[PDB]
Amino acid sequence: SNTLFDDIFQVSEVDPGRYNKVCRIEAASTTQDQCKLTLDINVELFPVAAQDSLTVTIASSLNLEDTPATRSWRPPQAGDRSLADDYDYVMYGTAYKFEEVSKDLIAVYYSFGGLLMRLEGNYRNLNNLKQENAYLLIRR
Amino acid sequence: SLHKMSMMAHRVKVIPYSTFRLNLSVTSPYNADFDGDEMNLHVPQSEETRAELSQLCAVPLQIVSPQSNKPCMGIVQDTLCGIRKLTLRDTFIELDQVLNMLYWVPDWDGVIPTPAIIKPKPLWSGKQILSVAIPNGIHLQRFDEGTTLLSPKDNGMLIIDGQIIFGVVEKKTVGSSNGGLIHVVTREKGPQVCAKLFGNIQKVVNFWLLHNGFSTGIGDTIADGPTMREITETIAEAKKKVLDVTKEAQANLLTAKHGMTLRESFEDNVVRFLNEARDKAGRLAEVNLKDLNNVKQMVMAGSKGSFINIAQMSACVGQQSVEGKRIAFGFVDRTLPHFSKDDYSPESKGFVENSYLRGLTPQEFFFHAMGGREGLIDTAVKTAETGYIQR
Amino acid sequence: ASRHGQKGTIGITYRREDMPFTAEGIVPDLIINPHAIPSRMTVAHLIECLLSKVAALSGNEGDASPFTDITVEGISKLLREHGYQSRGFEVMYNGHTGKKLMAQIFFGPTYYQRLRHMVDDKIHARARGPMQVLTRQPVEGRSRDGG
Amino acid sequence: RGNLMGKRVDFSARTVISGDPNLELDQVGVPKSIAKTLTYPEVVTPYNIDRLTQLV
Amino acid sequence: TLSHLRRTNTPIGRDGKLAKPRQLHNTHWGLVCPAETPEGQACGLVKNL
Amino acid sequence: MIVPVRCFSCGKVVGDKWESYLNLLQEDELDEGTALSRLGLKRYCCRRMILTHVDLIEKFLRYNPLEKR
Amino acid sequence: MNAPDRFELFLLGEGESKLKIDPDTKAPNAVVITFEKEDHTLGNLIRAELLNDRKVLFAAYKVEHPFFARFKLRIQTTEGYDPKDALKNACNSIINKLGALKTNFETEWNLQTLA
Amino acid sequence: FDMGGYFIINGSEKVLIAQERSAGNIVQVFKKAAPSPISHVAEIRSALE
Amino acid sequence: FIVEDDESLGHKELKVRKGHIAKLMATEYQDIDVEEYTWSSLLNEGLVEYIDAEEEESILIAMQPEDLEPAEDVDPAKRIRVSHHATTFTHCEIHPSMILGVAASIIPFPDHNQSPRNTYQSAMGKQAMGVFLTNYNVRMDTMANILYYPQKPLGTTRAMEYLKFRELPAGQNAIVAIACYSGY
Amino acid sequence: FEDESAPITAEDSWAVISAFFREKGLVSQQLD
Amino acid sequence: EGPQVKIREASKDNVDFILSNVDLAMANSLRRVMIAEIPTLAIDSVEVETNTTVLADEFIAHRLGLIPLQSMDIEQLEYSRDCFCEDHCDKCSVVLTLQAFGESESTTNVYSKDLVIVSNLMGRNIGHPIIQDKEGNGVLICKLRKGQELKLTCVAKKGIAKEHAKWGPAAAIEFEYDPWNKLKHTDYWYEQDSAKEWPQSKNCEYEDPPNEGDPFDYKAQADTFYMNVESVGSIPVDQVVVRGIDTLQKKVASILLALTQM
RNA sequence: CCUAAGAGUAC
Ligand SMILES: [Mg+2]
Ligand SMILES: [Zn+2]
Ligand SMILES: [Zn+2]
CATH number of the domain to which B182 belongs: 1.10.274.100
C-alpha to C-alpha distance for D37 and E2, rounded to whole angstroms: 42
C-alpha to C-alpha distance for F3 and F14, rounded to whole angstroms: 8
Question: Within 7 Å: CB of I127 and strand L?
Answer: yes
Nucleotide showing the shortest C1' distance to residue E41 CA: L8
Q: Give the distance from CA K195 to its chain's centroid.
A: 35
Backbone φ, ψ for residue E32 (5° rounding) = -130, 155
Do B201 and B223 fall into the same domain?
no
First to last CA, chain D: 40
- Length of chain H equals 49
Do B199 and B108 fall into the same domain?
yes
Q: Which amino acid belongs to residue K217?
A: D
C-alpha to C-alpha distance for E24 and E45, rounded to whole angstroms: 10
Asked whether D2 and B184 are in contact (CB, 8 A), the reply is no
Q: B292, B293, B357: which to substitute to probe chain K, counting the most K Cβ within 10 Å? A: B292
Asked whether F11 and K169 are in contact (CB, 8 A), the reply is no
Contacts of B77 (CB under 8 A, 6+ apart): B24, B303, B304, C33, C35
Cα separations (Å) of C131 from C128, C144, D12, I24, K211? 9, 10, 15, 68, 81
* Residue of B40, B4, B44 whose CA lies nearest to B22: B40
Question: Within 7 Å: CB of I129 and strand L?
Answer: no
Q: Spell out the alpha helix ranges (H) of I13-64.
A: 18-31, 39-44
Contacts of I62 (CB under 8 A, 6+ apart): B338, I3, I68, I69, I89, I91, I92, I93
Cα separations (Å) of G10 from G38, G39, K160, K243, K254? 7, 9, 10, 18, 13
Cα separations (Å) of J25 from C8, G79, I43, I76? 35, 85, 16, 39
* Residue of K19, F45, K200, B293 whose CA lies nearest to C91: K200
Q: What is the largest CA-CA distance in chain E?
A: 31
Q: K181, K189, K218: which to substitute to probe chain A, counting the most A Cβ within 10 Å? A: K218
Asked whether K172 and F43 are in contact (CB, 8 A), the reply is yes
CATH 2.170.120.12 placement within chain K: 40-165
Asked whether C82 and B194 are in contact (CB, 8 A), the reply is no
- In this structure, is the dihedral angle defined by the CA atoms of residues B160, B165, B170 and B172, taken in order, positive or negative? negative
C-alpha to C-alpha distance for B49 and B61, rounded to whole angstroms: 17
Contacts of I147 (CB under 8 A, 6+ apart): C114, F1, I129, I130, I131, I169, I170, I171, I172
Asked whether A39 and A23 are in contact (CB, 8 A), the reply is no
- Ligand 1: centre distance to CA B244 (Å): 46
Asked whether K5 and K18 are in contact (CB, 8 A), the reply is yes
Count contacts between B and C (CB, < 8 Å): 112
Contacts of G3 (CB under 8 A, 6+ apart): B16, B17, B18
Strands A133-139 and B11-15: unpaired
Domain K40-165, CATH class in plain words = mainly beta
For residue E44, count other CB atoms closer than 10 A to its CB: 23
- Ligand 2: centre distance to CA D8 (Å): 51
**Contact yes or no for K7 and G106 at CB 8 A:** no
Question: Within 7 Å: CB of B323 and strand L?
Answer: no
Domain count, chain G: 1
- Rg value, chain H, Cα: 20
Please report, for the domain that includes residue A36, its CATH number: 2.40.50.140
First to last CA, chain C: 30
C-alpha to C-alpha distance for B352 and B312, rounded to whole angstroms: 10
Angle between helices F44-51 and F32-39 in degrees, nearest 10: 120
Strands C92-93 and C124-126: unpaired
Asked whether B197 and B178 are in contact (CB, 8 A), the reply is no
- Ligand 2: centre distance to CA C13 (Å): 19
Contacts of C110 (CB under 8 A, 6+ apart): C2, C30, C45, C48, C49, C52, I173, I174, I175, I176
What domain range is G41 assigned to? 1-115
Interface residue A98 vs chain B (CB under 8 A) = no
Strands C62-63 and I155-156: parallel
The helix (H) or strand (E) run that includes residue C113 is none
* Residue of I88, I111, I87 whose CA lies nearest to I99: I111
Asked whether K25 and G41 are in contact (CB, 8 A), the reply is no
Do B239 and B329 fall into the same domain?
yes
Asked whether B166 and B151 are in contact (CB, 8 A), the reply is yes
C-alpha to C-alpha distance for C64 and I66, rounded to whole angstroms: 20
Backbone φ, ψ for residue I40 (5° rounding) = -65, -30
C-alpha to C-alpha distance for A136 and B122, rounded to whole angstroms: 14
Asked whether B22 and D20 are in contact (CB, 8 A), the reply is yes
Asked whether G8 and G56 are in contact (CB, 8 A), the reply is no
The helix (H) or strand (E) run that includes residue H16 is none
- Name the CATH superfamily, with its identifier, for domain F1-66: Homeodomain-like (1.10.10.60)
Beta bridge mates, K23:
none
Question: Within 7 Å: CB of B383 and strand L?
Answer: yes
Cα separations (Å) of I22 from B86, B248, H36, J18, K194? 64, 51, 63, 13, 50
- In this structure, is the dihedral angle defined by the CA atoms of residues C49, C50, C52 and C53, taken in order, positive or negative? positive
**Contact yes or no for D22 and G64 at CB 8 A:** yes
Strand L nucleotides with an atom less than 7 Å from a protein beta carbon? 1-2, 7-11
Interface residue E20 vs chain H (CB under 8 A) = no
Contacts of D6 (CB under 8 A, 6+ apart): none
Cis upstream peptide for B120 (omega within 30°): yes
DSSP category for residue H25: S
DSSP category for residue E28: G
Contacts of B367 (CB under 8 A, 6+ apart): B320, B327, B335, B350, B352
Q: How far is B164 from chain K (nearest CA, A)?
A: 25
- In this structure, is the dihedral angle defined by the CA atoms of residues B96, B99, B100 and B102, taken in order, positive or negative? positive
C-alpha to C-alpha distance for I126 and I130, rounded to whole angstroms: 10
Q: How was this structure determined?
A: cryo-EM
* Residue of K166, K175, K165, K180 whose CA lies nearest to K230: K175
Asked whether G41 and K30 are in contact (CB, 8 A), the reply is no
Contacts of G39 in chain C (CB under 8 A): 18
Do B200 and B89 fall into the same domain?
yes
C-alpha to C-alpha distance for B279 and H44, rounded to whole angstroms: 49
Q: Rounded to the nearest 5 degrees, what angle is found at the Cα of A44, between the Cα atoms of A41 and A48?
A: 55
C-alpha to C-alpha distance for E44 and E27, rounded to whole angstroms: 14
Q: Spell out the alpha helix ranges (H) of chain F.
A: 18-26, 32-39, 44-51, 57-60
Burial class from Cβ neighbours inside 10 Å (0-12, 13-18, 19+) for residue F67 reads: exposed
**Contact yes or no for J31 and H16 at CB 8 A:** no
Do B146 and B161 fall into the same domain?
yes
Contacts of C136 (CB under 8 A, 6+ apart): none
C-alpha to C-alpha distance for B148 and B150, rounded to whole angstroms: 5
The three-state secondary structure class of I167 is: coil
Contacts of C69 (CB under 8 A, 6+ apart): I78
Cα separations (Å) of K60 from B47, I129, I177? 54, 20, 31
Strands K94-101 and K149-159: antiparallel
Q: C14, C19, C37: which to substitute to probe chain B, counting the most B Cβ within 10 Å? A: C37
First to last CA, chain K: 32
Asked whether K126 and K73 are in contact (CB, 8 A), the reply is yes
Strands C21-22 and I61-62: unpaired
Report CA dihedral (C77, C81, C83, C84) to the nearest 10 degrees: -20
Residue whose Cα is closest to the C1' of L11: B383
Backbone φ, ψ for residue E34 (5° rounding) = -60, -35
Contacts of I175 (CB under 8 A, 6+ apart): C26, C27, C28, C29, C30, C107, C108, C109, C110, F8, F9, F45, F48
Which H, E and C letters describe chain B, residue by residue? CCCHHHCCECEEEEECCCCEEECCCCHHHHCCCCCCCEEEEECCCCHHHHHHHHHHCECHHHCEECCCCEECCCCCCHHHHHHHHHCCCCCEECHHHHHHHHHHCCCCCCCCCCCCEEECCCEEEHHHHHHHHCCCCCCEEECCCCCCCCCCCCCCEEEECCEEEECCCCHHHHCCCCCCHHHHHHHHCCHHHHHHHHHHHHHHHHHHHHHHCCECCHHHHCCCHHHHHHHHHHHHHHHHHHHHHHHHHHCCCCCCCCCCCHHHHHHHHHHHHHHHHHHHHHHHHHHHCCCCCHHHHHHHHCCCCCHHHHHHHHHCCEECCECCECCCCCECCECCCCCCCCCCCCCCCCEECCCCCCCCCHHHHHHHHHHHHHHHHHHHHHHHHHHHHHC
For residue B247, count other CB atoms closer than 10 A to its CB: 11
Q: Spell out the alpha helix ranges (H) of C5-81.
A: 43-58, 72-81
Asked whether C48 and C110 are in contact (CB, 8 A), the reply is yes
Q: Which amino acid belongs to residue B128?
A: Q
Hey, which bits of C20-147 come out as E strands?
21-22, 30-32, 62-63, 89-90, 92-93, 105-112, 124-126
Task: Count how many Cα atoms sit within 13 Å of the Cα of residue B96 in the half-sphere of its side chain.
Answer: 17
Which H, E and C letters describe chain G, residue by residue? CCCCCHHHHCCCCCCCCCEEEEECCCCCCEEEEEEECCCHHHHHHHHHHHHCCCCEEEEEEECCCCCCCEEEEEEEECCCCCHHHHHHHHHHHHHHHHHHHHHHHHHHHCCCCCC
C-alpha to C-alpha distance for G40 and G42, rounded to whole angstroms: 5
Contacts of I167 in chain H (CB under 8 A): 1
Asked whether I79 and C73 are in contact (CB, 8 A), the reply is no
* Residue of F14, F5, G42, G5 whose CA lies nearest to C17: G42
Asked whether H44 and H25 are in contact (CB, 8 A), the reply is yes
Resolution (A): 2.9
CATH topology of domain K1-39+166-262: Gyrase A; domain 2 (3.30.1360)
The helix (H) or strand (E) run that includes residue A44 is none
C-alpha to C-alpha distance for F59 and I167, rounded to whole angstroms: 10
Please report, for the domain that includes residue B45, its CATH number: 2.40.40.20
Produce one character per residue of B373-383: b if its CB has 16 or more CB atoms within 10 Å, e if not. Answer: bbebbeebbee
* Residue of G34, G47, G28, G35 whose CA lies nearest to G90: G47
Give me the residue from I111, I127, I172 closest to C112, CB to CB. Answer: I172
CATH 3.30.1360.10 placement within chain K: 1-39+166-262
Asked whether F16 and K139 are in contact (CB, 8 A), the reply is yes
C-alpha to C-alpha distance for J6 and I3, rounded to whole angstroms: 14
* Residue of B383, B377, B351, B378 whose CA lies nearest to B364: B351
Contacts of C96 in chain B (CB under 8 A): 210-211
C-alpha to C-alpha distance for B301 and B81, rounded to whole angstroms: 5
Backbone φ, ψ for residue K79 (5° rounding) = -65, 150
- Rg value, chain I, Cα: 22
Asked whether F57 and K54 are in contact (CB, 8 A), the reply is yes
Asked whether K174 and C23 are in contact (CB, 8 A), the reply is yes
C-alpha to C-alpha distance for C8 and B189, rounded to whole angstroms: 37
Asked whether E24 and E34 are in contact (CB, 8 A), the reply is yes
Contacts of B221 in chain C (CB under 8 A): 43, 46
What domain range is A80 assigned to? 1-140
Beta bridge mates, K18:
K6, K226
Contacts of B96 (CB under 8 A, 6+ apart): G47, G48, G51
How many helices (H) does chain A have, and how many strands (E)?
Answer: 1, 8
* Residue of G31, G49, G51 whose CA lies nearest to G90: G49
The three-state secondary structure class of A59 is: strand
Asked whether A133 and A19 are in contact (CB, 8 A), the reply is no
- Rg value, chain J, Cα: 13
Distance, CA of D14 to C1' of L7, in Å: 22
Burial class from Cβ neighbours inside 10 Å (0-12, 13-18, 19+) for residue D47 reads: exposed
- Ligand 3: centre distance to CA K36 (Å): 24
Please report, for the domain that includes residue G79, its CATH number: 3.30.1360.10
